Write a protein that binds this DNA or RNA. Structure first.
Ligand code: ZN
Ligand code: ZN
Length: 45
DNA sequence: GAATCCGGATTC
DNA sequence: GAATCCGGATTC
């Protein structure tokens, strides 16, 4: 089953997409803002 | 349908 | 082998 964000790390607590990282910039990506990506979810599923 | 986890293809 | 581009799939 797919994991949920931890909700507590600094990226999880950011309120908005940064608007300028690769994920916020690239027009075809479905990846979350790099500044928001949950630290826990960076571990391999 | 939006958000975005997740993993395949490319490219190095 | 792995970072990056990319988009299928789930969960709401
Ligand atoms: Zn961003
Ligand atoms: Zn988190």
């Amino acid at each position: 089953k797919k994991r949920k964000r931890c909700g507590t790390c600094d990226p999880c607590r950011r309120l908005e997409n940064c608007g300028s990282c690769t994920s916020c910039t690239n027009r075809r990506t479905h990846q979350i803002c790099k500044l928001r990506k949950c630290e826990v979810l960076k571990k391999k599923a």
